[PDB]
Design an enzyme around this catalytic site. Sequence first.
Site, PDB file in Angstrom:
ATOM      1  N   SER A 102      -0.583  15.646 -12.160  1.00 38.76           N
ATOM      2  CA  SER A 102      -0.682  15.398 -13.515  1.00 38.76           C
ATOM      3  C   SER A 102      -1.278  16.661 -14.245  1.00 38.76           C
ATOM      4  O   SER A 102      -1.636  17.250 -13.583  1.00 38.76           O
ATOM      5  CB  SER A 102      -1.889  14.234 -13.512  1.00 38.76           C
ATOM      6  OG  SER A 102      -2.629  13.926 -14.818  1.00 38.76           O
ATOM      7  N   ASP A 127       0.830  -1.338  -0.100  1.00 37.39           N
ATOM      8  CA  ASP A 127       0.171  -0.097  -0.067  1.00 37.39           C
ATOM      9  C   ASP A 127       0.803   1.297   0.024  1.00 37.39           C
ATOM     10  O   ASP A 127       1.128   1.579   0.966  1.00 37.39           O
ATOM     11  CB  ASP A 127      -0.843   0.019   1.106  1.00 37.39           C
ATOM     12  CG  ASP A 127      -1.758   1.342   1.253  1.00 37.39           C
ATOM     13  OD1 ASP A 127      -1.943   1.950   0.337  1.00 37.39           O
ATOM     14  OD2 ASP A 127      -2.362   1.358   2.218  1.00 37.39           O
TER      15      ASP A 127
END
Length: 330
Positions: free
Chosen positions: A199, A35
């Site tokens: 992004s 994770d």
Amino acid sequence: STGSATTTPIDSLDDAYITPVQIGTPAQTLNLDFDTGSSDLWVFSSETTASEVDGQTIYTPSKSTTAKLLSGATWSISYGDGSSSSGDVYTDTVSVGGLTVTGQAVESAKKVSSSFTEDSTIDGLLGLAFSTLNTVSPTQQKTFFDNAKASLDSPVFTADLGYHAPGTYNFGFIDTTAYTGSITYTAVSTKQGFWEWTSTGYAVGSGTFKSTSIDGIADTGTTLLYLPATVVSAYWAQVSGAKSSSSVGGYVFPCSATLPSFTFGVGSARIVIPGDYIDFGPISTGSSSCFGGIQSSAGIGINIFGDVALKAAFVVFNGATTPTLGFASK
């Protein structure tokens, strides 16, 4: 040193991925959920409340000659999906894919929430976010990666998650045969303890690319792709009959639909998520309404590039003094 381990979807939907981890001496192999959005290595154990164990493999520290109770240490964690666990702490030898750390904090669960109990395939979590998020008290502990880092050939790990197929976590090297083209690297902020990056934009299907900054986290422990409501609405508007359902808890679509791809930007590069990666199947057995793999982050407070996004790429988690993230197509 290096390590390399195969990671395997837990079910036909790729709801999560499990990776075998050797703990203790002799080794006790548990299948852990790696994770990159948390920083605790915790396991089902011989100390876990019996009624809360249902099929998981447990770590039994009393059978490990290298286990040592970390005196006075406890842990307690709550995850974004509302699940939680807590317990005490041992140090022990932990190996992943041939890479060994001695003295790793292994957090032994005394209690786990129902969602963990109900998932027989996940024996615990191995956190790969920054150690500043580790919950051990009163002395915070380091992640497996943080402990291994100085010994690794290069201070990196890579995630290569499969679509409906196994994939690979590598530690300490970049497998240049595992991706196409080049790896585009992008800046990381560690201010919130995550692999947080920005992004450069998105496209839906064959549509034009929208240049827009989307701050979010690379999170292997989250199944879906969670993005701003504007972006998500633009995606689902291209699927006839798709709608946001408050009763179901997100966007659903007719299972008869063909889903468009979704592209996200990494610098000037583009990662394309095929439409089929966005199908999470019937909302309930036998239903013709299917659950979408792109959902709104509104009210999460952060955008999350979970498995839906990451599995479309070869992803480098570069833990150099100034960390960065790399993405390549594959």
